[PDB]
Amino acid sequence: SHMWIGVISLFPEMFKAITEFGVTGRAVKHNLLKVECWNPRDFTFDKHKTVDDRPYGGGPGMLMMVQPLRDAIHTAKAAAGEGAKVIYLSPQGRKLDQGGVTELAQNQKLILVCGRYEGIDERLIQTEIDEEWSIGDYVLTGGELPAMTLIDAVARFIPGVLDGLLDCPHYTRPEVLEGLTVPPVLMSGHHEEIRKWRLKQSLQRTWLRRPELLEGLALTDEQRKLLKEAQAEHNS
Amino acid sequence: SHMWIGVISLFPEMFKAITEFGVTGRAVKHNLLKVECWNPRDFTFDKHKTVDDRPYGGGPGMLMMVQPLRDAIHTAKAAAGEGAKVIYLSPQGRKLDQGGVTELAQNQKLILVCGRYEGIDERLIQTEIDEEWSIGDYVLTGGELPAMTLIDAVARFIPGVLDGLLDCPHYTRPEVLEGLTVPPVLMSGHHEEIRKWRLKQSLQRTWLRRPELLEGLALTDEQRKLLKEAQAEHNS
Numbered sequence: 364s365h366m367w368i369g370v371i372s373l374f375p376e377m378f379k380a381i382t383e384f385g386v387t388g389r390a391v392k393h394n395l396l397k398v399e400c401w402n403p404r405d406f407t408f409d410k411h412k413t414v415d416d417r418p419y420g421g422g423p424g425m426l427m428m429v430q431p432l433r434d435a436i437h438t439a440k441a442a443a444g445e446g447a448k449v450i451y452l453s454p455q456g457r458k459l460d461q462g463g464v465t466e467l468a469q470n471q472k473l474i475l476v477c478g479r480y481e482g483i484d485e486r487l488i489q490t491e492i493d494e495e496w497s498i499g500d501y502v503l504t505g506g507e508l509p510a511m512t513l514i515d516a517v518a519r520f521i522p523g524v525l526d527g528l529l530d531c532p533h534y535t536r537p538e539v540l541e542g543l544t545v546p547p548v549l550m551s552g553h554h555e556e557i558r559k560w561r562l563k564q565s566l567q568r569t570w571l572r573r574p575e576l577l578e579g580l581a582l583t584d585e586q587r588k589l590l591k592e593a594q595a596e597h598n599s
Numbered sequence: 600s601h602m603w604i605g606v607i608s609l610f611p612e613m614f615k616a617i618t619e620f621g622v623t624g625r626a627v628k629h630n631l632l633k634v635e636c637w638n639p640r641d642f643t644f645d646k647h648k649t650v651d652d653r654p655y656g657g658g659p660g661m662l663m664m665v666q667p668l669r670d671a672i673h674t675a676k677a678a679a680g681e682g683a684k685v686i687y688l689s690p691q692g693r694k695l696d697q698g699g700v701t702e703l704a705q706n707q708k709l710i711l712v713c714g715r716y717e718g719i720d721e722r723l724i725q726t727e728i729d730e731e732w733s734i735g736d737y738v739l740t741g742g743e744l745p746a747m748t749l750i751d752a753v754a755r756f757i758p759g760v761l762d763g764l765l766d767c768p769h770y771t772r773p774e775v776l777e778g779l780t781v782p783p784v785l786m787s788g789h790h791e792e793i794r795k796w797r798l799k800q801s802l803q804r805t806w807l808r809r810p811e812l813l814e815g816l817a818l819t820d821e822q823r824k825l826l827k828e829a830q831a832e833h834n835s
Protein backbone atom coordinates (compact mmCIF):
# COMPACT_ATOMS: atom_id res chain seq x y z
CA SER A 364 0.00 0.00 0.00
CA HIS A 365 1.82 3.04 -1.42
CA MET A 366 1.74 6.21 0.66
CA TRP A 367 2.02 9.67 -0.86
CA ILE A 368 3.00 12.65 1.26
CA GLY A 369 3.06 16.19 -0.09
CA VAL A 370 5.10 18.67 1.94
CA ILE A 371 4.92 22.48 2.00
CA SER A 372 8.18 23.94 3.35
CA LEU A 373 10.59 26.84 2.93
CA PHE A 374 13.43 24.34 3.51
CA PRO A 375 12.63 21.31 1.32
CA GLU A 376 16.24 20.05 1.42
CA MET A 377 15.81 19.23 5.14
CA PHE A 378 13.65 16.31 4.02
CA LYS A 379 16.67 14.59 2.46
CA ALA A 380 17.26 13.45 6.06
CA ILE A 381 14.36 11.03 5.74
CA THR A 382 14.24 10.45 1.97
CA GLU A 383 17.92 9.54 1.50
CA PHE A 384 18.75 7.49 4.64
CA GLY A 385 17.78 4.44 6.63
CA VAL A 386 14.40 2.75 6.72
CA THR A 387 12.49 5.70 5.26
CA GLY A 388 15.20 6.13 2.61
CA ARG A 389 14.67 2.52 1.57
CA ALA A 390 10.90 3.04 1.48
CA VAL A 391 11.36 5.96 -0.91
CA LYS A 392 13.83 4.12 -3.15
CA HIS A 393 11.47 1.11 -3.35
CA ASN A 394 8.49 3.37 -4.19
CA LEU A 395 6.63 2.36 -1.03
CA LEU A 396 6.64 5.98 0.08
CA LYS A 397 6.69 9.08 -2.07
CA VAL A 398 7.54 12.46 -0.59
CA GLU A 399 6.97 15.53 -2.79
CA CYS A 400 7.89 19.04 -1.65
CA TRP A 401 6.64 22.48 -2.70
CA ASN A 402 8.45 25.64 -1.54
CA PRO A 403 6.36 28.83 -1.06
CA ARG A 404 9.46 30.73 -2.21
CA ASP A 405 8.81 29.34 -5.70
CA PHE A 406 5.32 30.89 -5.73
CA THR A 407 6.47 34.45 -5.05
CA PHE A 408 6.39 37.14 -7.74
CA ASP A 409 8.50 39.93 -6.29
CA LYS A 410 12.19 40.41 -7.06
CA HIS A 411 13.33 39.33 -3.60
CA LYS A 412 11.02 36.31 -3.32
CA THR A 413 9.45 37.49 -0.07
CA VAL A 414 7.82 34.76 2.01
CA ASP A 415 7.10 36.52 5.31
CA ASP A 416 4.72 39.37 6.23
CA ARG A 417 3.88 41.57 9.21
CA PRO A 418 1.16 40.59 11.68
CA TYR A 419 -1.87 42.83 12.05
CA GLY A 420 -1.87 44.31 15.55
CA GLY A 421 1.89 44.67 15.54
CA GLY A 422 4.24 43.03 17.99
CA PRO A 423 7.51 41.29 17.31
CA GLY A 424 7.91 38.53 14.79
CA MET A 425 6.59 37.80 11.35
CA LEU A 426 4.10 35.41 9.81
CA MET A 427 4.30 33.39 6.66
CA MET A 428 3.07 35.49 3.77
CA VAL A 429 -0.39 34.32 2.71
CA GLN A 430 -0.27 34.39 -1.10
CA PRO A 431 2.87 32.25 -1.73
CA LEU A 432 1.84 29.76 0.97
CA ARG A 433 -1.76 29.56 -0.24
CA ASP A 434 -0.59 29.03 -3.83
CA ALA A 435 1.86 26.29 -2.76
CA ILE A 436 -0.88 24.50 -0.83
CA HIS A 437 -3.27 24.69 -3.79
CA THR A 438 -0.59 23.22 -6.05
CA ALA A 439 0.01 20.34 -3.63
CA LYS A 440 -3.75 19.64 -3.43
CA ALA A 441 -3.96 19.55 -7.21
CA ALA A 442 -1.10 17.04 -7.36
CA ALA A 443 -2.67 14.89 -4.63
CA GLY A 444 -6.00 14.56 -6.39
CA GLU A 445 -8.96 13.34 -4.35
CA GLY A 446 -8.84 12.27 -0.72
CA ALA A 447 -5.71 13.95 0.65
CA LYS A 448 -5.90 15.11 4.26
CA VAL A 449 -4.15 18.43 4.84
CA ILE A 450 -2.21 18.63 8.11
CA TYR A 451 -0.74 21.74 9.72
CA LEU A 452 2.15 20.89 12.07
CA SER A 453 1.39 23.18 14.99
CA PRO A 454 2.01 23.62 18.73
CA GLN A 455 -1.74 24.33 18.98
CA GLY A 456 -2.54 20.96 17.43
CA ARG A 457 -3.71 17.61 18.76
CA LYS A 458 -0.90 15.92 20.66
CA LEU A 459 0.64 13.12 18.58
CA ASP A 460 0.91 9.68 20.19
CA GLN A 461 0.98 6.18 18.72
CA GLY A 462 -2.83 6.02 18.59
CA GLY A 463 -2.76 9.22 16.55
CA VAL A 464 -0.01 7.83 14.32
CA THR A 465 -2.11 4.72 13.58
CA GLU A 466 -5.04 7.00 12.75
CA LEU A 467 -3.01 9.20 10.38
CA ALA A 468 -1.45 6.11 8.79
CA GLN A 469 -4.90 5.04 7.49
CA ASN A 470 -4.57 7.80 4.87
CA GLN A 471 -3.03 6.97 1.50
CA LYS A 472 -2.39 10.66 0.87
CA LEU A 473 -1.31 13.40 3.26
CA ILE A 474 -0.25 17.00 2.77
CA LEU A 475 1.94 18.39 5.53
CA VAL A 476 2.21 22.14 5.96
CA CYS A 477 5.34 23.36 7.79
CA GLY A 478 5.22 26.76 9.42
CA ARG A 479 8.09 29.13 10.10
CA TYR A 480 8.28 32.47 11.98
CA GLU A 481 5.25 33.01 14.27
CA GLY A 482 3.16 30.70 12.11
CA ILE A 483 0.41 31.10 9.55
CA ASP A 484 -2.69 33.27 9.15
CA GLU A 485 -5.60 31.87 11.17
CA ARG A 486 -7.95 32.20 8.19
CA LEU A 487 -5.70 29.90 6.12
CA ILE A 488 -6.03 27.31 8.86
CA GLN A 489 -9.80 27.67 8.60
CA THR A 490 -9.91 27.53 4.80
CA GLU A 491 -7.06 25.13 3.88
CA ILE A 492 -6.23 22.89 6.84
CA ASP A 493 -8.10 19.74 7.83
CA GLU A 494 -6.30 18.91 11.07
CA GLU A 495 -3.70 20.51 13.35
CA TRP A 496 -1.18 18.15 15.02
CA SER A 497 1.63 18.76 17.55
CA ILE A 498 4.53 16.34 18.11
CA GLY A 499 5.04 17.63 21.64
CA ASP A 500 4.81 20.41 24.19
CA TYR A 501 8.17 21.98 23.38
CA VAL A 502 9.06 24.97 21.23
CA LEU A 503 10.85 24.51 17.89
CA THR A 504 12.04 26.86 15.11
CA GLY A 505 9.81 25.42 12.42
CA GLY A 506 7.40 22.66 11.44
CA GLU A 507 9.92 20.68 9.39
CA LEU A 508 11.30 18.40 12.14
CA PRO A 509 7.72 17.66 13.31
CA ALA A 510 6.68 16.82 9.72
CA MET A 511 9.74 14.56 9.33
CA THR A 512 8.93 12.90 12.66
CA LEU A 513 5.34 12.28 11.57
CA ILE A 514 6.48 10.87 8.20
CA ASP A 515 8.89 8.47 9.89
CA ALA A 516 6.19 7.29 12.29
CA VAL A 517 3.48 6.68 9.67
CA ALA A 518 6.00 5.11 7.24
CA ARG A 519 6.41 2.17 9.65
CA PHE A 520 2.83 1.16 8.80
CA ILE A 521 3.43 0.75 5.07
CA PRO A 522 3.63 -2.92 4.08
CA GLY A 523 7.20 -3.91 3.24
CA VAL A 524 8.87 -0.99 4.99
CA LEU A 525 9.84 -2.91 8.14
CA ASP A 526 1.14 -2.64 22.95
CA GLY A 527 1.18 0.31 25.33
CA LEU A 528 4.13 -0.72 27.50
CA LEU A 529 7.76 0.40 27.66
CA ASP A 530 10.24 -2.02 26.08
CA CYS A 531 12.15 -4.61 28.12
CA PRO A 532 15.93 -4.28 28.54
CA HIS A 533 17.96 -5.83 25.72
CA TYR A 534 21.39 -7.49 25.83
CA THR A 535 23.94 -8.51 23.23
CA ARG A 536 27.60 -9.53 23.18
CA PRO A 537 29.72 -9.65 25.28
CA GLU A 538 28.49 -11.91 28.09
CA VAL A 539 30.16 -9.62 30.63
CA LEU A 540 30.46 -5.84 30.15
CA GLU A 541 32.36 -3.88 32.79
CA GLY A 542 31.50 -6.59 35.32
CA LEU A 543 27.80 -6.53 34.41
CA THR A 544 26.39 -9.89 33.35
CA VAL A 545 23.54 -10.89 31.05
CA PRO A 546 20.45 -12.22 32.93
CA PRO A 547 20.86 -16.05 32.92
CA VAL A 548 17.28 -16.61 31.74
CA LEU A 549 18.19 -14.97 28.41
CA MET A 550 20.94 -17.60 27.95
CA SER A 551 18.68 -20.51 28.90
CA GLY A 552 17.08 -21.13 25.52
CA HIS A 553 13.75 -21.49 27.33
CA HIS A 554 11.54 -19.53 24.93
CA GLU A 555 8.53 -19.34 27.24
CA GLU A 556 10.58 -18.30 30.27
CA ILE A 557 12.24 -15.65 28.12
CA ARG A 558 8.90 -14.31 26.87
CA LYS A 559 7.52 -14.02 30.40
CA TRP A 560 10.70 -12.40 31.74
CA ARG A 561 10.63 -9.76 28.98
CA LEU A 562 6.93 -9.04 29.54
CA LYS A 563 7.49 -8.78 33.30
CA GLN A 564 10.40 -6.36 32.78
CA SER A 565 8.24 -4.26 30.45
CA LEU A 566 5.48 -4.08 33.04
CA GLN A 567 7.96 -3.23 35.81
CA ARG A 568 9.65 -0.48 33.79
CA THR A 569 6.30 1.02 32.75
CA TRP A 570 5.11 1.05 36.37
CA LEU A 571 8.32 2.65 37.66
CA ARG A 572 8.90 5.19 34.88
CA ARG A 573 5.52 5.91 33.31
CA PRO A 574 2.83 4.68 35.69
CA GLU A 575 0.17 6.84 34.02
CA LEU A 576 0.49 4.63 30.92
CA LEU A 577 -0.68 1.62 32.97
CA GLU A 578 -3.93 3.26 34.03
CA GLY A 579 -4.87 3.44 30.36
CA LEU A 580 -4.52 -0.30 29.88
CA ALA A 581 -6.77 -3.30 30.40
CA LEU A 582 -4.12 -5.77 31.50
CA THR A 583 -4.52 -9.45 30.60
CA ASP A 584 -4.60 -12.03 33.40
CA GLU A 585 -0.97 -12.88 32.65
CA GLN A 586 0.05 -9.24 32.67
CA ARG A 587 -1.76 -8.65 35.97
CA LYS A 588 0.14 -11.57 37.53
CA LEU A 589 3.59 -10.56 36.27
CA LEU A 590 3.03 -6.92 37.29
CA LYS A 591 2.02 -8.05 40.78
CA GLU A 592 5.19 -10.18 40.94
CA ALA A 593 7.39 -7.31 39.75
CA GLN A 594 5.88 -4.99 42.36
CA ALA A 595 6.38 -7.61 45.08
CA GLU A 596 10.04 -8.11 44.13
CA HIS A 597 10.53 -4.36 44.02
CA ASN A 598 9.20 -4.12 47.57
CA SER A 599 11.71 -6.90 48.28
CA SER B 600 27.18 31.36 25.44
CA HIS B 601 28.49 28.76 22.97
CA MET B 602 26.84 25.35 23.04
CA TRP B 603 28.64 22.18 21.99
CA ILE B 604 26.69 19.07 21.06
CA GLY B 605 28.38 15.78 20.25
CA VAL B 606 26.24 13.28 18.34
CA ILE B 607 26.64 9.50 18.01
CA SER B 608 24.77 8.24 14.93
CA LEU B 609 24.97 5.71 12.11
CA PHE B 610 23.51 8.40 9.82
CA PRO B 611 25.47 11.60 10.56
CA GLU B 612 24.44 13.22 7.25
CA MET B 613 20.84 13.47 8.54
CA PHE B 614 22.08 16.26 10.80
CA LYS B 615 22.74 18.49 7.80
CA ALA B 616 19.00 19.20 8.11
CA ILE B 617 19.68 21.30 11.18
CA THR B 618 23.30 22.37 10.61
CA GLU B 619 22.84 23.74 7.07
CA PHE B 620 19.39 25.42 7.19
CA GLY B 621 17.34 28.05 8.96
CA VAL B 622 17.81 29.33 12.48
CA THR B 623 19.97 26.40 13.63
CA GLY B 624 21.99 26.65 10.41
CA ARG B 625 22.71 30.28 11.20
CA ALA B 626 23.68 29.37 14.77
CA VAL B 627 26.22 26.87 13.43
CA LYS B 628 27.65 29.26 10.83
CA HIS B 629 28.03 31.99 13.48
CA ASN B 630 29.75 29.55 15.89
CA LEU B 631 26.99 29.91 18.48
CA LEU B 632 26.30 26.20 18.20
CA LYS B 633 28.71 23.45 17.30
CA VAL B 634 27.47 20.01 16.31
CA GLU B 635 30.06 17.23 16.00
CA CYS B 636 29.14 13.71 14.86
CA TRP B 637 30.81 10.33 15.39
CA ASN B 638 29.64 7.27 13.44
CA PRO B 639 29.99 3.83 15.13
CA ARG B 640 30.63 2.45 11.62
CA ASP B 641 34.00 4.23 11.73
CA PHE B 642 34.97 2.32 14.90
CA THR B 643 34.44 -1.15 13.44
CA PHE B 644 37.37 -3.44 12.60
CA ASP B 645 35.81 -6.16 10.47
CA LYS B 646 35.79 -6.11 6.66
CA HIS B 647 32.08 -5.39 6.41
CA LYS B 648 31.97 -2.71 9.12
CA THR B 649 29.30 -4.49 11.15
CA VAL B 650 27.34 -2.27 13.53
CA ASP B 651 24.50 -4.54 14.65
CA ASP B 652 24.44 -7.72 16.76
CA ARG B 653 21.98 -10.40 17.88
CA PRO B 654 20.07 -10.06 21.15
CA TYR B 655 20.62 -12.66 23.87
CA GLY B 656 17.39 -14.59 24.37
CA GLY B 657 16.61 -14.53 20.68
CA GLY B 658 13.55 -12.99 19.13
CA PRO B 659 13.29 -10.82 16.05
CA GLY B 660 15.35 -7.72 15.53
CA MET B 661 18.89 -6.68 16.20
CA LEU B 662 20.66 -4.38 18.64
CA MET B 663 23.45 -1.94 18.07
CA MET B 664 26.76 -3.75 18.39
CA VAL B 665 28.42 -2.84 21.69
CA GLN B 666 32.09 -2.37 20.79
CA PRO B 667 31.78 0.16 17.90
CA LEU B 668 29.11 2.13 19.79
CA ARG B 669 31.06 2.10 23.06
CA ASP B 670 34.22 3.25 21.27
CA ALA B 671 32.34 6.07 19.49
CA ILE B 672 30.88 7.26 22.78
CA HIS B 673 34.29 7.22 24.46
CA THR B 674 35.73 9.26 21.61
CA ALA B 675 32.94 11.84 21.91
CA LYS B 676 33.49 12.08 25.69
CA ALA B 677 37.19 12.67 25.14
CA ALA B 678 36.43 15.47 22.68
CA ALA B 679 33.90 17.05 25.05
CA GLY B 680 36.30 17.24 27.97
CA GLU B 681 34.83 17.84 31.42
CA GLY B 682 31.17 18.41 32.19
CA ALA B 683 29.34 16.91 29.21
CA LYS B 684 26.01 15.26 29.97
CA VAL B 685 25.43 12.10 27.93
CA ILE B 686 21.85 11.67 26.69
CA TYR B 687 20.31 8.55 25.17
CA LEU B 688 17.31 9.38 22.97
CA SER B 689 14.89 6.65 23.99
CA PRO B 690 11.18 5.77 24.09
CA GLN B 691 11.84 4.63 27.68
CA GLY B 692 13.14 8.07 28.59
CA ARG B 693 11.75 11.06 30.46
CA LYS B 694 9.10 12.77 28.36
CA LEU B 695 10.47 15.98 26.82
CA ASP B 696 8.48 19.18 27.36
CA GLN B 697 9.50 22.83 27.47
CA GLY B 698 10.44 22.59 31.15
CA GLY B 699 12.75 19.72 30.23
CA VAL B 700 14.17 21.70 27.30
CA THR B 701 15.00 24.63 29.61
CA GLU B 702 16.70 22.18 31.97
CA LEU B 703 18.79 20.56 29.22
CA ALA B 704 19.65 23.99 27.81
CA GLN B 705 21.55 24.84 31.03
CA ASN B 706 24.32 22.51 29.80
CA GLN B 707 27.16 23.97 27.74
CA LYS B 708 28.03 20.48 26.48
CA LEU B 709 25.78 17.58 25.54
CA ILE B 710 26.42 14.22 23.93
CA LEU B 711 23.41 12.71 22.18
CA VAL B 712 23.36 8.99 21.49
CA CYS B 713 21.02 7.89 18.67
CA GLY B 714 19.85 4.31 18.65
CA ARG B 715 18.82 2.19 15.68
CA TYR B 716 17.32 -1.33 15.43
CA GLU B 717 15.82 -2.51 18.76
CA GLY B 718 18.13 -0.16 20.65
CA ILE B 719 21.26 -0.52 22.75
CA ASP B 720 22.56 -2.93 25.37
CA GLU B 721 21.08 -2.16 28.80
CA ARG B 722 24.53 -2.33 30.42
CA LEU B 723 25.79 0.46 28.13
CA ILE B 724 22.92 2.60 29.36
CA GLN B 725 24.04 1.87 32.92
CA THR B 726 27.73 2.52 32.27
CA GLU B 727 27.73 5.32 29.65
CA ILE B 728 24.43 7.20 29.75
CA ASP B 729 23.54 9.97 32.20
CA GLU B 730 19.91 10.54 31.22
CA GLU B 731 17.31 8.94 28.95
CA TRP B 732 14.87 11.31 27.17
CA SER B 733 11.88 10.68 24.88
CA ILE B 734 10.43 13.30 22.51
CA GLY B 735 7.04 11.61 22.56
CA ASP B 736 4.92 8.50 22.92
CA TYR B 737 5.14 7.43 19.29
CA VAL B 738 7.36 4.88 17.58
CA LEU B 739 10.16 5.98 15.23
CA THR B 740 12.84 4.18 13.18
CA GLY B 741 15.78 5.72 15.00
CA GLY B 742 16.96 8.30 17.51
CA GLU B 743 18.17 10.82 14.92
CA LEU B 744 14.96 12.83 14.46
CA PRO B 745 14.53 13.00 18.26
CA ALA B 746 18.14 14.21 18.65
CA MET B 747 17.60 16.83 15.92
CA THR B 748 14.37 17.92 17.61
CA LEU B 749 16.14 18.28 20.95
CA ILE B 750 19.01 20.25 19.35
CA ASP B 751 16.57 22.65 17.69
CA ALA B 752 14.71 23.18 20.96
CA VAL B 753 17.78 23.85 23.13
CA ALA B 754 19.40 26.00 20.40
CA ARG B 755 16.66 28.61 20.90
CA PHE B 756 18.16 29.33 24.34
CA ILE B 757 21.60 30.31 23.05
CA PRO B 758 22.10 34.08 23.16
CA GLY B 759 22.03 35.56 19.66
CA VAL B 760 20.28 32.63 18.00
CA LEU B 761 16.81 34.20 17.96
CA ASP B 762 4.40 30.95 29.38
CA GLY B 763 2.40 27.72 29.42
CA LEU B 764 -0.47 28.77 27.14
CA LEU B 765 -1.29 28.04 23.51
CA ASP B 766 -0.57 30.91 21.11
CA CYS B 767 -3.25 33.39 20.03
CA PRO B 768 -4.45 33.43 16.40
CA HIS B 769 -2.33 35.57 14.07
CA TYR B 770 -3.38 37.56 11.00
CA THR B 771 -1.52 39.20 8.14
CA ARG B 772 -2.39 40.61 4.71
CA PRO B 773 -4.91 40.68 3.10
CA GLU B 774 -7.61 42.38 5.18
CA VAL B 775 -10.18 39.97 3.77
CA LEU B 776 -9.37 36.34 2.86
CA GLU B 777 -12.14 34.26 1.29
CA GLY B 778 -14.69 36.49 3.01
CA LEU B 779 -12.99 36.15 6.40
CA THR B 780 -12.03 39.45 8.01
CA VAL B 781 -9.29 40.43 10.45
CA PRO B 782 -10.58 41.15 14.01
CA PRO B 783 -11.07 44.96 14.12
CA VAL B 784 -9.21 45.28 17.44
CA LEU B 785 -6.00 44.22 15.65
CA MET B 786 -6.44 47.18 13.25
CA SER B 787 -7.20 49.66 16.03
CA GLY B 788 -3.63 50.56 16.98
CA HIS B 789 -4.69 50.30 20.62
CA HIS B 790 -1.66 48.45 22.01
CA GLU B 791 -3.23 47.62 25.38
CA GLU B 792 -6.50 46.41 23.86
CA ILE B 793 -4.49 44.28 21.45
CA ARG B 794 -2.39 42.76 24.25
CA LYS B 795 -5.48 41.84 26.27
CA TRP B 796 -7.30 40.42 23.24
CA ARG B 797 -4.32 38.19 22.39
CA LEU B 798 -3.97 36.99 25.98
CA LYS B 799 -7.71 36.28 26.18
CA GLN B 800 -7.58 34.29 22.92
CA SER B 801 -4.61 32.30 24.25
CA LEU B 802 -6.50 31.47 27.43
CA GLN B 803 -9.63 30.53 25.47
CA ARG B 804 -7.74 28.28 23.05
CA THR B 805 -5.84 26.58 25.88
CA TRP B 806 -9.08 25.92 27.76
CA LEU B 807 -10.86 24.52 24.69
CA ARG B 808 -8.02 22.47 23.22
CA ARG B 809 -5.67 21.60 26.07
CA PRO B 810 -7.53 22.19 29.34
CA GLU B 811 -5.08 20.00 31.28
CA LEU B 812 -2.39 22.63 30.64
CA LEU B 813 -4.45 25.19 32.60
CA GLU B 814 -4.59 23.07 35.74
CA GLY B 815 -0.80 23.29 35.89
CA LEU B 816 -0.82 27.08 35.96
CA ALA B 817 -1.17 29.72 38.66
CA LEU B 818 -3.09 32.29 36.65
CA THR B 819 -2.53 35.99 37.35
CA ASP B 820 -5.51 38.13 38.35
CA GLU B 821 -5.67 39.47 34.80
CA GLN B 822 -5.52 36.00 33.32
CA ARG B 823 -8.25 34.77 35.66
CA LYS B 824 -10.51 37.64 34.54
CA LEU B 825 -9.93 37.20 30.80
CA LEU B 826 -10.39 33.42 31.05
CA LYS B 827 -13.68 33.94 32.90
CA GLU B 828 -14.76 36.37 30.15
CA ALA B 829 -13.78 33.94 27.38
CA GLN B 830 -15.72 31.13 29.07
CA ALA B 831 -18.76 33.40 29.49
CA GLU B 832 -18.70 34.42 25.82
CA HIS B 833 -18.28 30.80 24.81
CA ASN B 834 -21.40 29.93 26.79
CA SER B 835 -22.95 32.85 24.88
Ligand SMILES: c1cc(-c2ncc[nH]2)ccn1
Pocket residue numbers: 452453454478479496497498499501502503504505506507509
Ligand atom coordinates in the same frame (compact mmCIF):
# COMPACT_ATOMS: atom_id res chain seq x y z
C1 LIG C 1 4.49 20.83 15.72
C2 LIG C 1 4.93 22.05 15.20
C3 LIG C 1 5.78 22.83 15.99
C4 LIG C 1 6.30 24.10 15.50
N1 LIG C 1 7.07 24.97 16.22
C5 LIG C 1 7.36 26.02 15.34
C6 LIG C 1 6.77 25.78 14.09
N2 LIG C 1 6.10 24.56 14.20
C7 LIG C 1 6.15 22.40 17.26
C8 LIG C 1 5.66 21.17 17.70
N3 LIG C 1 4.84 20.38 16.96
Ligand SMILES: c1cc(-c2ncc[nH]2)ccn1
Pocket residue numbers: 688689690714715732733734735737738739740741742743745
Ligand atom coordinates in the same frame (compact mmCIF):
# COMPACT_ATOMS: atom_id res chain seq x y z
C1 LIG D 1 13.25 9.20 21.45
C2 LIG D 1 13.79 8.12 20.75
C3 LIG D 1 12.93 7.34 19.98
C4 LIG D 1 13.43 6.22 19.20
N1 LIG D 1 12.65 5.34 18.48
C5 LIG D 1 13.56 4.46 17.89
C6 LIG D 1 14.87 4.80 18.23
N2 LIG D 1 14.78 5.92 19.07
C7 LIG D 1 11.56 7.63 19.94
C8 LIG D 1 11.11 8.72 20.67
N3 LIG D 1 11.92 9.51 21.42
